[PDB]
Structure formats: structure tokens, C-alpha cells
């Protein structure tokens, strides 16, 4: 409908009403679609993700890192923004958690998930890039942080870029979105001292080749 793929995958507050099919033959977006990446930022290799998802023989969403039990040392409730409102309230993406310091600290974070069930798993996460050093102190406390993510195939260290940027959807900062696929038998790990937005939901799937995306107002 009105959502684009990034909205649907990230869990834009307005894409919650969309139903989920276990298999898709092709993907349809309307030309009027304009819901995704509500917190301004880049979605890396977005076109490649869109291509991979165009046809799926089997798809399921599951909670990869449960919101209430996975992060006892971090605050998983204050992670909201006016850029992604829900019924007028500050909110955030349904499939992601923006962790912030608990009390006055952000203990080093370390998590993993083992994909031993047989489907490939799409894992998304993102990185917060605060407008200023005051926001880094408000949200993470650790002044100089890094984020590290990896698997047997993926390995990347990220470092936040704090700067005042032009204001978009009232934000002077940015949040970038990254993703990878975890092949069966492998594991994905996350490590951070701040600025990491973590998945709570992830998608298990089996892909088909040869389909695509149609942009149209033609009814289904």
C-alpha cells in the first residue's frame, strides 16, 4: 500500500497494519508510497535488499533478541522520536530497539544469535549519529564509542560521526540502516559501546529468483 519496502522491513509505525504473507510472488508499492526511514538517514544497499525480497517462497518474522530479557543493563524504553510518531506519541520502528544508557552508564554490549534452523536470516540494525556531543552524553555517556558487527562472512567496525546536519523531520542527526544475511549454521554477533540500534525482530526466509517490484495503483 502506502509503505515502501524499507518501511515494512524496519517497522515504520504506519506499516503495522499491513498483513504478512508467508510467500510473495512479486511486490507491489503504490506511486504514492512514502513511509520508511522516518528517522532520516541512509539505508545501505537498499536496492540490493529490495531485489532479494522481490520473491520469497517462505517467510517468517521472529523475535531475535527479546525486548524485555536481552538487555538488562541498558534502557530499552526511552528509545523514541518525534520523527516516527504513532498516534501522536513519540515512537520508533517496530522491529528495532534504540538502546540508551541506563542510569548513568552504557556498559559494553555483547550479543549473539546462532542460526541453526536452516533458513537464511535477515538481520537489520542501525547506527545513531547524534547532532552534537551533548546528545552523545544524553543518550550514551561514553563520549567515544564504536559499534562492531559480524558473522563468518560479514565484518565491520563502525564509528559515529557527530555533526550538526540540516534539519530533516526535525532531526539534526542521522540514523543509518545496515543489514546482512546469516547463512544456516552461522552466527551473528553485535558489540557496542554506544550508538547501536539493535534488532528485536528478524526475518527467516527462502528466496526465489526471477521476480521484481511493480509500482502501480492498479488494485489487487
Amino acid at each position, epitope marked *: 500500500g502506502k509503505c515502501n519496502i524499507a518501511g515494512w522491513i524496519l517497522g515504520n509505525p504506519e506499516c503495522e497494519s499491513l*498483513s*504478512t504473507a*508467508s510467500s510473495w510472488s512479486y511486490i507491489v508499492e503504490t506511486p504514492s508510497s512514502d513511509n520508511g526511514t522516518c528517522y532520516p538517514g541512509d539505508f545501505i544497499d537498499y536496492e540490493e535488499l529490495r531485489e532479494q525480497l522481490s520473491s520469497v517462497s517462505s517467510f517468517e518474522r*521472529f523475535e531475535i533478541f*527479546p525486548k524485555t530479557s536481552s538487555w538488562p543493563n541498558h534502557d530499552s524504553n526511552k528509545g523514541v522520536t518525534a520523527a516516527c510518531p504513532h498516534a501522536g506519541a513519540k515512537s520508533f520502528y517496530k522491529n528495532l530497539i534504540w538502546l540508551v544508557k541506563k542510569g548513568n552508564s552504557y556498559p559494553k554490549l555483547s550479543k549473539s544469535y546462532i542460526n541453526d534452523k536452516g533458513k537464511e536470516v535477515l538481520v537489520l540494525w542501525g547506527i545513531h549519529h547524534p547532532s552534537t556531543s551533548a546528545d552523545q552524553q544524553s543518550l550514551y555517556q561514553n563520549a567515544d564509542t564504536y559499534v562492531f558487527v559480524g558473522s563468518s562472512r560479514y565484518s565491520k567496525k563502525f564509528k559515529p560521526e557527530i555533526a550538526i546536519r540540516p534539519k530533516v523531520r526535525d532531526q539534526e542527526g542521522r540514523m543509518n540502516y545496515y543489514w546482512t544475511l546469516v547463512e544456516p549454521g552461522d552466527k551473528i554477533t553485535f558489540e557496542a559501546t554506544g550508538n547501536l540500534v539493535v534488532p528485536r525482530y528478524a526475518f527467516a526466509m527462502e528466496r526465489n529468483a526471477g521476480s521484481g517490484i511493480i509500482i502501480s495503483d492498479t488494485p489487487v
Partner: antibody
Amino acid sequence: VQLLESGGGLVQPGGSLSLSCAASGFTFSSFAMSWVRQAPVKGLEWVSMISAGGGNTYYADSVKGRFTISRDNSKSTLYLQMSSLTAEDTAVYYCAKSDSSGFQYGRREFWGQGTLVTVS
Amino acid sequence: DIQMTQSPSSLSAFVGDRVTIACQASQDIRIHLNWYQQKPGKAPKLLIYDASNLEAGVPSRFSGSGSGTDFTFTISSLQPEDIATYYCQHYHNLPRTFGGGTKVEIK
């Protein structure tokens, strides 16, 4: 979140009865749902499960089609229709939220309080 | 099917004692094991998932470990509020199954 069960009560041998579970506090349509049975003799066993979109079902082989599992996503309600009831079907039935839309990758689930079905 | 064996069927200990139970799979189930606490009159509450990952709101005295076919559950030092039947459940594949449960009494 909240799962509330109803139906149950006394059914004769044979016959049929409809059980149901109303859900709130979560998007019903986003998760698979299932039924679990607790007998006074056999502690716990699964009865049936249905995927979030209603596209896939699984039944215990103790049932073999004797019971039908279905959903109404618009009303956030889970149903179990049991037919041809026998003595072994006396148990407390419980509904649960499955942590995945597709069964296979769910890890944890939880139950609301159940209802008692007596066959006599 | 993979049928879990749980032992003892009943355990009793005094408050402050250290309490553990064991459970086995007939097949290697990696770590796809849940532990539940069933208080009388209540649906079982999940305490532990993926063999050792403690669930939200569960007291830190509860723990567990294990892999493959051999699993354990502990409630550390026993409190009177811990009277419950504890159950071993796995989700390696379908059908999901449960062990018989261990009734833990306190005195």
C-alpha cells in the same frame, strides 16, 4: 499481554464443542498461535498450531484431524473445534502466543489461563 | 519424535538449600530447551529459554545450562515461593514435547 479463554464445560462422548481464545495487547495477526493440553495424567502435550496468516497448520497425531484449528484475525480470536470427543480428551486446554509468525523459528511462548473440558 | 526424560519426579528440600533437576533428550537438540514453572492453579510460566537464557522478570536465582542431550535446571538457594512443578520442554522440531515435570516441595 492478555489471552482470555472461554468455552469448555461438559460434553458427552462423541458430540463436539467449540473453544476460543480472545487476544489483546498485541497485534494478533503478527504471531502464530497454538493450543496446549494438560491432562490430569499426562503432564503436558501440544494439540495444534496455526501460522499467523492462517496458511499453515499442524496437529498432534493424537488428534489426526479430529480437531480443527482456525483464526479470525479481524476479531483477534483463536478457535479450536473439537469433534468426536473421547475420555482421553478430558484436559485443561490453554492458548498461547508463539513468538514467530511461522512456527519454526519461535523460541518462547506463553499461555493465558485455560478452560476445562470434561468428556462424560 | 523426541521425548524428554525428566528426573527426579519429585524433589523436596528446606529453604536455603540448593536445588537442581536434570532432563534428557532422546536426540541431540542443540540448545532448543525451555523450562517452565507451574504453580498450582496457574498456566506454566516460562523461566528459561534456549537452555540458559533467563526470561524477563525471573529472579536471578534461577539458572540453567546444557546442550545436545544433557540439560540441567537450577533454582539456586530455594525460597518458599518456589513451590511449583517444573517442566522440561523442547522445540527442536515438531511435535514439540514436554517431559513429565518435577514437583518441588519445600520443608
